[PDB]
């Protein structure tokens, strides 16, 4: 993601496009006028146009245009499709390495070495600012030893002391990743993966949250710089016969992880924790109700998680019948047995069966979350955690249960937040308080299965807050089992 510039103004973007760019040149930058949103600065007829990209929480909405899952999918679309006519021809690469995984800057010699010893493995690397020589940089690689390679900045160009000269540190790292440096003793300085700083033991969660609260925006931006690596094919969703099956024509499921209906299409993806499964799907459309019940039956889904409220826009269509009423959705029959109302949710006991087959009947428990706000995320994660614990205990109670169907609007915002929290809290529930948990790495893993899961920093912070809250209730529980009470 070279076209994204994290620390530039609107005026700086115009100068960089007029002096170092041409007609068709472009870049992406965070909106300083409205935090959270983004701006697409494109050069046309020797003039710079700034187009607003609204990050609503559910999608990336181009002002007076189309809606997308990620900023990378927006850029990828306009570089090969029509239209705006404004053209996205040449991506203007960023010299700023601040948003990269491997960059640290603030780090020192002994500090980088201590982090590489415990957190690192063979091939772990980092780029830090030089202490003894201001302006220069240091590349520290683990291989079993830690090797330091100086990066000299000579006239805005970077080099290791010999060879090619690069415009940016990202260009230096990317080149030596493909062509690795050879040590004098025949050792190979492999740049396999950057040093993991985000990986933390679930006991030091409160301390990490404290650090990011003074932080969170820096960590989430680093994760957003990885969305170019998740540009998998979405051809099945692009089909003419599948266009109206999509709520948003560009937020499409990945072909390798999509749910194939054995008329085989549905905007849904199977989420597998690649280190309980989930079906991350969009909000039901009036023409996709039949396809939804085909998916629940085929995949043997027993728990449905509705993250959108019942009560001025449509996010999900009533795919279930009224209490005590029975409905036929093509070949599938749904019977609403009982509706249980809690303050945060509504539990609907639905009986799904194939028409003409009584033996195929199973109980599908639909959990309808209502307390979620119209705009933004709640500050207290207690309500969501009590809901997910109830969802997990219902899922665990059923013997032959398939994936948990989770849906919102585009099936990427709330769906992504609810799935990631449930994955992370499942590790803490099974492996106890002492276990390794990585928030952005879990999101990136979920993101490789469905386009842009967890699109906002507020939703990213909410996961950290929900994980911290869940560990605290667990810690208080064990402490209470040891408490003298009367």
Task: Summarize the structure in words.
The chain is globular. The protein folds into 3 domains: 99 residues, SHC Adaptor Protein (2-Layer Sandwich); 95 residues, SHC Adaptor Protein (2-Layer Sandwich); 292 residues, Protein tyrosine phosphatase superfamily (Protein-Tyrosine Phosphatase, Chain A, Alpha-Beta Complex). By secondary structure, the protein is an alpha+beta fold. The chain is built from 12 helices and 24 strands. An 8-stranded mixed β-sheet has the order 16-17-23-18-22-21-20-19, sandwiched between helices. It has a 6-stranded mixed β-sheet with strand order 5-4-3-2-1-6. Strands 7, 8, 9, 10, 11 and 14 form a 6-stranded mixed β-sheet that branches. Pfam families: SH2, Y_phosphatase. Belongs to the protein-tyrosine phosphatase family. Non-receptor class 2 subfamily. InterPro entries: Prot-tyrosine_phosphatase-like, PTP_cat, SH2, SH2_dom_sf, Tyr_Pase_AS, Tyr_Pase_cat, Tyr_Pase_dom, Tyr_Pase_non-rcpt_typ-6/11.
Can you lay out the helices and strands and say which pair or pack?
Layout: H1 10-19, E1 25-30, E2 38-44, E3 47-55, E4 60-62, E5 67-68, H2 71-78, E6 90-91, E7 103-105, H3 109-118, E8 124-129, E9 137-142, E10 146-154, E11 157-159, H4 169-178, E12 181-182, E13 188-189, E14 193-194, E15 200-201, H5 205-213, H6 216-224, H7 235-238, E16 268-271, E17 278-281, H8 289-298, E18 303-306, E19 326-329, E20 332-341, E21 345-354, E22 362-369, H9 382-397, E23 404-407, H10 414-430, E24 436-437, H11 439-447, H12 457-480
Parallel strand pairs: 1-6, 7-8, 8-14, 17-23, 18-22, 18-23
Antiparallel strand pairs: 1-2, 2-3, 3-4, 4-5, 8-9, 9-10, 10-11, 12-13, 15-24, 16-17, 19-20, 20-21, 21-22
Helix pairs in contact: 10-11, 10-12
């Amino acid at each position: 993601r070279r076209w994204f510039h994290p620390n530039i103004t609107g005026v700086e973007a115009e100068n960089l496009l007029l002096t170092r760019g041409v007609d068709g040149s472009f870049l992406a930058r965070p909106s300083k006028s409205n935090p959270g949103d983004f701006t697409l600065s494109v050069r046309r007829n020797g003039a710079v146009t700034h187009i607003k990209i609204q990050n609503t929480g559910d999608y990336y909405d181009l002002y007076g245009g189309e809606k997308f899952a990620t900023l990378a999918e927006l850029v990828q679309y306009y570089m090969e499709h029509h239209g705006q006519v404004i053209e996205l021809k040449y991506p203007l690469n960023c010299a700023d390495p601040t948003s990269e995984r491997w960059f640290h800057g603030h780090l020192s010699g002994k500090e980088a070495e201590k982090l590489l010893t415990e957190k690192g493995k063979h091939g772990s690397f980092l780029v830090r600012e030089s202490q003894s020589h201001p302006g220069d940089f240091v590349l520290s690689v683990r291989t079993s030893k830690v090797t330091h390679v100086m990066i000299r900045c000579q006239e805005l160009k970077y080099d290791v002391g010999g060879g090619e000269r690069f415009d940016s540190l990202t260009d230096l790292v990317e080149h030596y990743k493909k062509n690795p440096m050879v040590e004098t003793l025949g050792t190979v300085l492999q740049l396999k993966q950057p040093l993991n700083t985000t990986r933390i033991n679930a006991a030091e969660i409160e301390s990490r949250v404290r650090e990011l609260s003074k932080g969170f925006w820096e960590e989430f931006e680093t994760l957003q710089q990885q969305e170019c690596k998740l540009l998998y094919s979405r051809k099945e969703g692009q089909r003419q016969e599948n266009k109206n099956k999509n709520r948003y024509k560009n937020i499409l499921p990945f072909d390798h992880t999509r749910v194939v209906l054995h008329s085989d299409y549905i905007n849904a993806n199977i989420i597998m924790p690649e280190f309980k499964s989930y079906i991350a799907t969009q909000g039901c459309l009036q023409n996709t109700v039949n396809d939804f019940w085909r998916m629940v039956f085929q995949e043997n889904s027993r728990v449905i998680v509705m993250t959108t409220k019942e009560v001025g826009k449509s996010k999900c269509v009533k795919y279930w019948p009224d209490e005590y009423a029975l409905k036929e959705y093509g070949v599938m029959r749904v019977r609403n047995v009982k509706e249980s109302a809690a303050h945060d949710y509504t539990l609907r006991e639905l009986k799904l069966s194939k028409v003409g087959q009584g033996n195929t009947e199973r109980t599908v428990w639909q959990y309808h979350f209502r307390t979620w706000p119209d705009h933004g995320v709640p500050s207290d994660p207690g309500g969501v955690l009590d809901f997910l614990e109830e969802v997990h205990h219902k899922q665990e109670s059923i013997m032959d249960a398939g994936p948990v169907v989770v849906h919102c609007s585009a099936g990427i915002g709330r769906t992504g937040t609810f799935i990631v929290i449930d994955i992370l809290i499942d590790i803490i529930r099974e492996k106890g308080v002492d276990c390794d948990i990585d928030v952005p790495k879990t999101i990136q893993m979920v993101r490789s299965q469905r386009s842009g899961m967890v699109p906002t920093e507020a939703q990213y912070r909410f996961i950290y807050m929900a994980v911290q809250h869940y560990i605290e209730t667990l810690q208080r529980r064990i402490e209470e089992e040891q408490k003298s009470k009367r």
